[PDB]
Every structure is written in C-alpha cells, then in structure tokens.
Design a binder for this molecule. Structure first.
Ligand SMILES: OC[C@H]1O[C@@H](O[C@@H]2[C@@H](O)[C@@H](O)O[C@H](CO)[C@H]2O)[C@H](O)[C@@H](O)[C@@H]1O
Ligand SMILES: OC[C@H]1O[C@@H](O[C@@H]2[C@@H](O)[C@@H](O)O[C@H](CO)[C@H]2O)[C@H](O)[C@@H](O)[C@@H]1O
Ligand SMILES: [Mg+2]
Ligand SMILES: [Mg+2]
Lengths: 724, 724
C-alpha cells in the first residue's frame, strides 16, 4: 500500500497498540497455533502477557510450519483492530529442509555463486513454509575457534566475509525493492551487531574489547557491505562493545548503524538481549532497560517484556519521547509493507500449497554441489586419493554411520532425509566393510573389530568428528580437540599397515596435527548438510575434485590462539634470516605459523599461474588492474582459487602483512587456460587512521597473487602523485 | 649544581654534542672498559660509531662492575669537552647480588614493606657497583601466563600493582629530591610504557589492542601511581598501542605521559625500539624513525643509531625543531644533576670501595624473609605440613639439587651463592634421601631409584619446576604446563603409598590440577632467589608459616586464558541457580572458575574476621571507612592478608564483579586479636566512562571483606545525594 496509508496506521494506533507492535513472541503464545499448545498457559503467566498484548504483538519467531503460520495469522486478524498482520521470522542459517554446508564450510568454497544459490534455495523453501524473514547472514569476524559460533561465520577475513555476506543477502532477497511481489524471496537480517566473535577466551557471551579503530578496520566492514547491499533487518549482539551492551549502545546503533551506515530498517534484539542489559549491570531494572534500548533505536524486543510492561509509564512520565516509539512502529509497518503483508498477509500461501517446492531433487543437487565446493583437502600423500571405484574400503570411526552430519543451526532439517557416510559410499564403491565406534570411547572390542575389517580391505576410510552439539551457540570448548579416543583410534588404525584416508566432520578448526601425521590423506568435510555422504563419496572417488580453501587458520595448538593470516609484523619479527635467535617474536614450544594457513587447500590437478606486467607506479585514487592467466597442466579437470592480497609497507598505523582483496574460483578442464582480471580500487589501498578517518596514504604496497596466503608471487607498486 | 648552570651547559653544547647526549651504549663500546674489550672495534664498525660519537654519548647500559664504571667514566671525562659525566643504567629487577623472589612472587606477598626492602637492598648493592639507574619497576598488567615476562609483573590486579610499584620506587629512590646526597639509593625507571603485558596469544613482542577506555581503566594506573610517587625515568614499550608503536606514539608519550601524567624526566627507549618502528611498518627508514621518536618525546635511544646518524640532517633540513632536541638534552642533564654527577661523577665510589656492602648476611636474611613472605601454600590435605624435624624425607625431582632457583632477569647474581633445596633441607632435617631427575625426562632407572628412596623414608618432598629460561623475555609458551615427564613423575610418586608435598618452582601460572590431585600438599615457591633452599626448609618445617596469596589466577587449562578475578558479568551469567542450563556463559569441557583464584592461599593458622558496622548510605565524594577485627584462633602464630573489594552494581559501563581496593597483611600470635581500618576514598568508587571521563555515579555498590576474592562477607552501600 501507499506510504500515506502506512503513516495513517501509525497515527491511528493507541499507545498500547504501538508498544505491543514492538514485541516478538514464540508461536505457541498466540491463539491459533497448532503445535506446543501445552506450553501456552504457564508461559503466558510467567511473562504476564494478556490478550491485549498477544492480539497486538508485532511479530512471531520460529513458526513450525505453513499451517502454524496460517492459523496464527488468521486468528490474529480476526481480532486485531486495525488489521496489522504479523511478520514471521526464523533462523534459516544454512538451509531450511534441504540443508547445505555450515557457513564456515561455505567460507572455504571461496565461491560467491555457491553462497547465493544456498541462500536462494533456503528462501524458496522457507517462504513455502510461511516464513518472511531469516536471521542470516551471520557476519561476525572470527579469530578464535574455541567459540562454538565460528560455524556460522565465513571466517577470519573481513573481505571474504563481506563478499559472501552480500551473496547471501542477494540470494535470500533478490531485488530488495520487489519483496512485495517476489514471494519466493525473503527479508534478510544481518547479525549480530557488532563484534560478537571476539568473545574473550572463546567463552559464550563473554566480554569483547578492541579499539574503535580496530572495530572499524576489521569488525564492521562485513555488516556494512550487507547493509549497503540492501539487507532489510539488523540484529543486535549479546556482548558489550567498549563496555556497553550492544543492545543499549546508543553510539553504536544510532550514530554508526543508522547514521554512518544509513540503516533505516528494523533493529531487532537478539533473544532476551533487551532484558539482559540488567545482568550486564548497565540497567538497574526493566524500566531502565526499556528506556535505554529504545533510546538506542531497538525496534523489536525478542521474547522479553521490558517494552510491553514499561514503555507506557516511561512515555507518560516524560522520561522517553513518544516520537521514538512512533519511529520504531513506522519501521515495523514499513517492513510489513515491503513484504506485501497488507495486500497478502499469507504471502502467497493462502490458496497455494507449496509443499512441492520443499526438498526437491534439484535442491538436493545444489546442496551436493555446495558440499563438494566447500570441502578442503588438507593432505594427500602418495596420490592415495581419488580412490578407484573397485577399492576395497574399511569404513571405521564415529562418523562411519552417524546421522549427525547436518550441522549446528539446523532448525528445520531432518536427519532421516540426510545421507550418512556409509550410505554415500555404498552407492559408489562395491566393497565396503564398516565398523562404527562411539564418539568418545575406544574399546578393546572395537579394536578387534577394526583390525578384522582392515585386514580384509585395502584402504581405510577413517571417519572422525564432532557431534554438532559441541558447537553452535553456547558450545564453547577451552581445548579445540576431538575427544582423545578419536586421536587414539587414528593412532591404532595407523599401526594396521594399510593406507588411511581421514574424513573429518566438525564445525570449528581443530588441532589436527596428530591426525595428519597418522594418516596419508585428510579431507575436511565440515558438516556438508543433507547430502553429506554423497559429497564424501564423490570427493573420495574423484567424481568431484576437491577445491575448497581454508577460510580460518588451523592452530598448531589451543594456546596459539588467536592466530590468523592478516597479522601485524611486530617490532621483532622472525625471518628466515634470524630463525633460532632468542630475542624475536616466537614461542619456545611451537612454530609461529598455524598448522594450516588461510587460503590453503589441495586439488587432484596442478595449476600454473602467470600475472601480467603490473605498473611500477599508481596515482592516489587510482585502481590497480590485475590480470592473471591460469592453466591446468594436469590431466584432471579441476578448480583453483586465485587470491590477491595487498600489503601497505609503511603507514601511520602498523598494517597487516597481507590482506585479501580479491578472489575468483576458476574452473579448468585438463590442459585448459583462462585469463581473469581483478580491479583493486583505491578503497583496497585505504585504511582507518588513528583519527578514525578512512584514508589513502602515498607510498609502497606489495601485491601478492597466488593460491593461498603463502603460495604467492609478489609485486611492488609505488602509490603517489595526484588524486583520481 | 644550580639550574642556571645546567641551562648554561645546553647553550654551550654543539649540535653534534646534543645529538650524542641522546645515545645509550653497552660498556664495551667505550674506551676504558675492563671487560669484553675484543668486541669493541667490530661492533663500533657494525654500528658505524666514531670517537666523536662515543666520547659524547649520554649513557652507559649494563656496566659489568664498579671497575668497569670507574674506568669508563675516568677515560670518558679526560676527553669530554665540557665535563658532562656518563649516567650508568642497569637491570636490577629483583635483586643485584643478593637475589630476592621474582616480582610475581613478591606480588603474592601482598606486603608493601617486603617490596620496599627488596628495592632498598637492591639499590644498596647496585650503587656499590656503580649503577645510577635501575630499569625497575616493571608495571605491565598481566592476564596471560603464556607470556614469559609475567615473572616481572606483580600480576593481574592494577591496585596491587600500583601499590607495590609505589613501594619499589620508594625502596630504590627514598626521597627523590635528595638523590644527589643519598648515594646508596638510585633512580627508578618505570617500564614498559604502555600495555606490553597484553601481547596477543602471549607471544613475545606481539600486537596489543584494547579500547582507550580499557587502557585508562586497567593498563595505565600502576605506571601512573609510580610516576606520581616520583619515579625518575620511564621506558617505552615494544608493542603497538592502538596500531602505533609506543616508542613513536605522540598521543601516548606527549599527551598522556608528559601531559596528563606530568612526567618531566628522561623517556628512554626499550632496547632497539626506536629502530624497530621500521619493522613495525610505521617508519620507512632510520630518518623517519628518528624524526618520529623525537617528535614523541623519546630522550634516549638505547643501543641503536637512528638519532646519532639522522637528527643533524633533520634539524638542518628543518623537518625537526632543534628545540625538541634541547629539551631532551636538558632532561638528560637534569637526571645527571639529580644524581649528583656534576659534583661526584663516581657517585660515592671514588675513594670508598663499597665491596663490604654486597651480599652481606643481613641482606641474605632479608631475601630469605622475602621468600617466606611470597610463597603460596595451595594445598595441605590433613595437616601434612609443617613436617616435624625428625620426619624422614625422600627429596626427589628436577628441583632437588638444581642450582636454577634465582629466577629470570637475574643479571648480576651467581648460582654459586644460592642455596639449593637439598642444602636447605639438610640444615633443618636430619634424614634426607635425594634422587635427582632431569627436567624433561623420567627414565626407568629414575623410577627404581625413586622407589627405593620413598620406601626408605616417611614423606616425599617432590621438587618440580621450570628452568628460568622457559620464561622471562622471549620465553613465550603456547601451553602453560611443565614438561610432561614431571606430571608423570608426580603420578608415579603418588602410587608409592607415602604422603607427598610438592614444592613447585616457576615463573608463571601453570596447569597444576594434575599436581594437586597427585599430592597431599602443594607449595608454590616461584623462584625465591638466593636463599631458596632455606625459604623452602623453613616453610616445610613450620619455622615459617606460609602467608602468600595468589596475585595471578591459575587457569583450569591453557585455553581458559585469559581468566581473571575482575571480570565482567556478561548478559548471561552462570549462577548457582541456572547451572546445568545450555544457554549461559560457560564452557562444555571446563568450569568458568580458574583452578585457584586471585587472593587465595593457605596458612598453618586459622583466623576469624568480622567487619564493624558500615553505613547504609554515603554521599558522592565521601570516603568509606572500613574497620575489620581479625583474630588468630589457632595455636600457631602467622599472617593473614585482609582484602577489601568493591563492586559497582549498575553503571553506564559494565563494571567488574569485584576490584581490589585495599589490603593489609596482619601478623598475629596464637590467640592474638587486632583491629585494622581502611579508607576507600570516592576515587575507589570511580571509573572511566565511554567519553573517557573519570566519574562517580550515584547508586549501589557492594563491599566485600575477606581473605580471598572468593572468601568474603558482602555488604551494600547506596551512594547518592550531594557531593563533598
Ligand atoms: O533465535 C533468534 C535469535 O536468538 C538466539 O537464539 C536463542 C538463544 O539465544 C536462546 O535464547 O535460546 C533460544 C531458544 O529458542 C534461541 O532462539 C541466537 O543467538 C540468534 O542468532 C538467533 O538468530
Ligand atoms: O636491558 C635493557 C632493557 O631492554 C630490554 O632488554 C634487551 C633485550 O630486548 C634484547 O635486545 O637483548 C638485550 C640483551 O642485552 C637486552 O638488554 C628489556 O626488554 C628491558 O626490559 C630492559 O630493561
Ligand atoms: Mg603506506
Ligand atoms: Mg553504579
């Protein structure tokens, strides 16, 4: 409808109506739900909610199906005075019913189109079940694999994170200004604003602290890119940002998000984060929490009651302007209008059962493709892999048969539709002997049984991994290791004298040195989603050629953390030339380098890269154009990820030794050659100075072109002169 | 001499003379050195130093003896044009020849007077060997025991650090205005300005980052307190502060140190730190390094040649004002004048050989007392300790006979003067059987010898620890554990059936769970210094009663780091009454609490405390007066450390759950009772806000009185009303 009609609605609502429009509730707090109605009575009572509240609530969180939605919306519109339909929101993080790889695995793809397609398929299905908004992309930079929520990030690089964030937004939303017509796309909600990934000691919800400059330099750019690409909502973070919980942090959310980033959509709280500012010790009570969170421009309180119980008295007493409440309501109604909910509150479902669009074969194929793009081949000694279809396989370990391959933050997908490792292998390989073992134990009887199966077969597929419940939210591990039993199983299998491939499933970097040394090949599958066993079987047999690169550094040991490729030099760097001197930046007991670096991943193919003549000089404001010719010089078709890094040699702030500024994943048949070109704009050369100005300084930059952060040729470009 | 004549000298100096005044060199770069003379010509050549440079150099670093100093100063003064004597500086960190406990252990003393005495003795001896300045106190706050330099800090609390920092300055300097007269005291140099102990991942020289607010709130207060107490010099830090190496950080050194903190003494670079800004990437070359470091107010370049080769041209070209140089020179000359060098350049040594004053019996008794104050009794199950003097002792492990008990940063003390554990124990106990093992091995042959000795005796003194070389500078350990052979040894010894005391020697918190669980008692001796074997024997026999408390938390495991007592609450705190629940701040694999907390330590005595009646309300600006009555209710004389904490329940920044604001260590005879009183000024109630104002807000505080950060009674005071 026309904007005048939306503004009119605001004018006509009562104060009590405007307040309740700022509340989101679980579906079973509403009449007309068709699941968990036994939770409704006691929980309404604990939260002290009445019909006056629920019949005017702004939003529903986590509907269970199209029918839940339809029934809830229908009963709500019988009783709502002005006819304002509910907006339905959900967590569609890496797939709805067709589950794609976890975001961190999608980071390792380095493939923007894989990510867009995952987001498109997710929206297709999620809209078919009545959801209007997804709480994705998660854009928290991560340098600390202790934190369970690394699985939801695309990793340690702001540039990569930004680029894949934009891809996800584009895939979920399509053309943002036509969400009232394109009812198979949905609104995206960027989360968690801001810097939640920097949780101290990797502990869930724990203190975050960095300088404002570092916040701008590394922690904000990805949210920003997703905002500028049209993300409709933003969600606040749990953590403090320079001492103030992000939810009530006025500077953060008004000055930065709404001012600098020019965000003018719904700011929704993370779950309970409005009330939790009390726990943080920056509000005395719910009256202060409500006031501070509304001052900071939070429009929508997720499942707590500070707003509904306290805004009236605040406004009546004049501690809080009613204009701020009106601004919040207007953003909520604009969101609804942007989804076409005032013409069609059932968003395409009312006379159109779209069951047919859910978990199709086309969709499963895309997830399989996603899975094969995201896996990272870490070791392959002796060209053990690809295995031949007639190789006789002993498939052993906790991930041989486990149905737990869909990943954390799989709110809607079902393990029964998933393909386990065994089932995946038996479609491809004629001889497989299996010995399942438990995640945390290694018994004598297991060893006997493993030994018998290995004696029978020619190669071992050792499937190790985490349960998903060991990560995700509030799955923090102080020591980033598999259970010791799995390391002991890898040690045992090694003694059996047969070649070993380890297929590792997990949601975080782990200490894998012991696994690499106990096997001939090591394939990092992360959690691939619905098609996990086929992803695995196609990569092992070579029907697919691994092409993933690490988007997060794998530490030598827990105590190396944080370790990341874009690090400062320090005043006493170790060099190949001073190696072994005492008075340099090193550890006595491990290497400075991570076990595996950002951008690292093997292939069954071999590539050669050639960079065309770069200029020796560039003007300020001028783009650098990088042309690179890649050739597949092997007999095996495959894909390589070309990466370009920039370094600022001398600057008014100590700058990272490299930063990624471009990447493209290039597909090449055996003997095929391509030229790809990159533009590094002058923004790729700029950074935040100690005055928090985004600046370009004249001087020397090095440019690194290659296939990891370590495998690069280096070039020098001197920036100076005039500007543009 | 009169201030007018100090000025006169500056006018009288040539540009080349003023430049060289800002250079510090090792003793063997000067003519007249009585040691390492063979190094002179080559290093001179490598640094491109001439006679004109060395003959006008400002300062000597690390003189080897009184005769080095005398010889150097005597030759220097025969050729110096204007008669400006050299100032001699040294690393006297926890003792000169009489070595006291490492500073972290002195931290565990909670004893201001012990700290002042260490410093007074240190100056007594150092001045006797011709040193004018010590590079102490080190006041870097530490939360990361991976960093080897934690041994030099007094720990994780800024208040303790502030308080003991003041004590060391007083002990070294006495009355600062009379350093020209009191030739047995010396100048203190506060180090390292600033925030060096926050090195990322505990890696030496590594990136530091935190918000400016946190810099002010936690990282600056102890340097400030030492400066206000009259510290004569300050030394720069190796690390970046917010992206800019401290040594050239104008904001840090002019605005904060010289401006806010009103420091008007010599600012000396850490070793090479001027040249190292090039390595950091914030200067292109030694001309830029010199210019920026002089801009930042660094007066004295330690053993690099940026100033000496670059200032002239910088001043000639007009890129730098000669006034900044004149100011650096005046500060150097004023420090010499404060030390009396213009009347007596030999600072009391010339016709008075003070060999008599070094390593006296009186001094050794003070170092032993310091060791007994500083040790921390962590476990004592079932009154194993004190041992009766007729107890038959199996003394086993790497620290049984090791002479490595003086600690890191022992530049001048000699192991030959130290007392090892066996020698100590044999002065007190009649029967000791000794089996020495290696630091990093546990052989079958050791196990047989250990077993034979334990079967012979009644009790096991298991002496474990670190070589000092595994810490101190550039002694960074990714995993904070002893060698695994020592943990194995503690497991083996436990199986032998006999009570075990573990006496642990080290320079950092370690993972000690496995030691506590494998023994009956556990005594943390750190590195006590010269009298270590007697410190240990007296604590074990009960001739001295353990009284130290932990000044740094001992983590459950490496991956818990940083863990510290003054932590934020977060938005989802684990409570007693939600424990077990998933969605709270916790780890899946360890407790939140450190294995041992700040302020914790046992005693052979038992004490009772009761806090006199506190007010319910206080005005802003008003002090809180806290009266505590302590009774020793055992038959054993000893000391308790009374500790007072404050918490700010609600603030405009999320405030720590506790902060230490007072402490006093009370000596009590069996049955003795004493009353102590504390004043917490309105400043204890104040913090830095998000605009970086030092502020006091009305509201609730809790006051905790007790004998650890955990063993406390709690009281509430509501601050409001008007201001005093
Ligand atoms: O789910 C929406 C939003 O909130 C958080 O999930 C919450 C979790 O914090 C806790 O409240 O448990 C409830 C159980 O339903 C979850 O909904 C997530 O941190 C956030 O990412 C998510 O988008
Ligand atoms: O001792 C002077 C001063 O500088 C540093 O010590 C240096 C060390 O950095 C390295 O360069 O090696 C030389 C060996 O002589 C040391 O002097 C210390 O970090 C600092 O604390 C000390 O006060
Ligand atoms: Mg530059
Ligand atoms: Mg307060």
């Amino acid at each position: 409808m026309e904007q005048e009609k939306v503004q009119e609605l605001v004018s006509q609502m009562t104060l009590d109506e405007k307040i309740a429009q700022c509340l989101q509730l679980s579906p079973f707090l509403f009449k007309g739900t068709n699941k968990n109605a036994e939770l409704t009575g006691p929980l309404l009572q604990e939260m002290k909610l009445t019909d006056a509240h629920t019949e005017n609530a702004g939003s529903v969180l986590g509907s269970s199906s199209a029918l839940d939605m339809i029934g809830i919306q229908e009963a709500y519109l019988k009783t709502n005075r002005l006819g304002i339909p509910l907006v339905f929101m959900a967590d569609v993080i890496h797939g709805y019913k067709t589950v794609f790889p976890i975001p961190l695995a999608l980071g390792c793809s380095f493939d923007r189109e894989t990510v867009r397609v995952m987001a498109e398929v997710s929206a297709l299905e999620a809209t078919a079940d009545g959801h209007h908004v997804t709480f994705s992309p998660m854009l928290d930079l991560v340098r600390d694999p202790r934190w369970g929520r690394v699985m939801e990030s695309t990793g340690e690089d702001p540039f990569l994170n930004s680029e894949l964030g934009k891809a996800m937004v584009d895939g979920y939303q399509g053309d943002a200004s036509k969400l009232n017509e394109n009812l198979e796309q949905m609104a995206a909600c960027v989360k968690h604003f801001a810097a939640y990934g920097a949780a101290e000691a990797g502990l869930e919800y724990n203190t975050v602290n960095m300088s404002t400059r570092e916040l701008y330099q590394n922690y904000l750019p990805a949210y920003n890119a997703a905002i500028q690409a049209g993300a409709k909502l933003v969600m606040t973070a749990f953590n403090v940002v320079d001492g103030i919980p992000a939810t009530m942090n006025k500077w953060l959310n008004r000055d930065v998000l709404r001012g600098e980033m020019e965000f003018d959509g719904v700011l929704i709280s993370a779950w309970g984060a409005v009330a939790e500012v009390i726990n943080h010790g920056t509000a005395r009570n719910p009256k202060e929490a409500a006031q501070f969170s509304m001052e900071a421009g939070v429009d929508l309180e997720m499942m707590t009651t500070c707003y509904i119980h306290e805004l009236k008295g605040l406004i009546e007493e004049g501690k809080l302007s009613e204009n701020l409440l009106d601004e919040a309501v207007l953003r909520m109604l604009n969101l609804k209008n942007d989804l076409g909910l005032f013409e069609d509150p059932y968003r395409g479902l009312k006379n159109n059962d779209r069951t047919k669009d859910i978990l199709t074969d086309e969709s499963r194929g895309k997830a399989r493709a996603a899975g094969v793009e995201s896996a990272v081949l870490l070791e392959n000694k002796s060209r053990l892999l690809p295995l031949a279809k007639e190789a006789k396989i002993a498939l052993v370990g906790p991930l041989a048969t486990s149905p737990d391959i869909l990943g954390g933050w799989n709110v809607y997908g079902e393990e029964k539709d998933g393909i386990n490792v065994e089932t995946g292998l038996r479609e491809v390989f004629e001889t497989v002997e299996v010995v399942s073992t438990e995640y945390t134990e290694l018994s004598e009887e297991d060893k006997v049984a493993v030994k018998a199966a290995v004696q029978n077969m020619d190669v071992v597929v050792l499937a190790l991994g985490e349960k998903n419940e060991w990560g995700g939210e509030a799955g923090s591990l102080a020591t980033i290791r598999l259970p010791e039993a799995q390391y002991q199983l890898a040690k045992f299998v090694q003694t059996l004298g047969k070649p070993v491939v380890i297929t590792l499933f997990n949601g975080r970097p782990l200490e894998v040195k012991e696994l690499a040394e106990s096997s001939d090949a090591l394939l990092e599958l992360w959690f691939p989603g619905t098609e996990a066993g086929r992803v695995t079987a196609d990569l092992l047999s070579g029907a697919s050629n691994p092409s993933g690169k690490l988007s997060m550094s794998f530490p030598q040991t827990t105590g190396q953390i944080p370790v990341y490729y874009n690090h400062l030099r320090t005043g006493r760097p170790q060099t190949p030339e001073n190696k072994g001197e005492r008075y340099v930046s090193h550890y006595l007991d491990i290497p400075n380098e991570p076990f595996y670096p950002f951008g690292y991943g093997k292939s069954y193919s071999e590539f050669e890269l050639k960079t065309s003549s770069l200029p020796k000089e560039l003007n300020l404001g001028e783009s650098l154009h990088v042309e690179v010719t890649i050739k597949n010089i092997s007999d095996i078709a495959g894909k390589e990820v070309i990466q370009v890094y920039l370094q600022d040699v001398t600057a008014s702030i100590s700058r990272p030794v490299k930063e990624l500024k471009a990447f493209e994943k290039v597909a090449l048949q055996a003997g095929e050659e391509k030229t790809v070109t990159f533009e590094l704009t002058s923004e790729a050369f700029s950074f935040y100075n100690h005055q928090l100005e985004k600046v370009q300084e004249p001087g020397l930059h090095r440019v690194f072109v290659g296939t990891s952060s370590e495998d690069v040729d280096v070039f020098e470009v001197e920036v100076g002169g005039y500007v543009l």
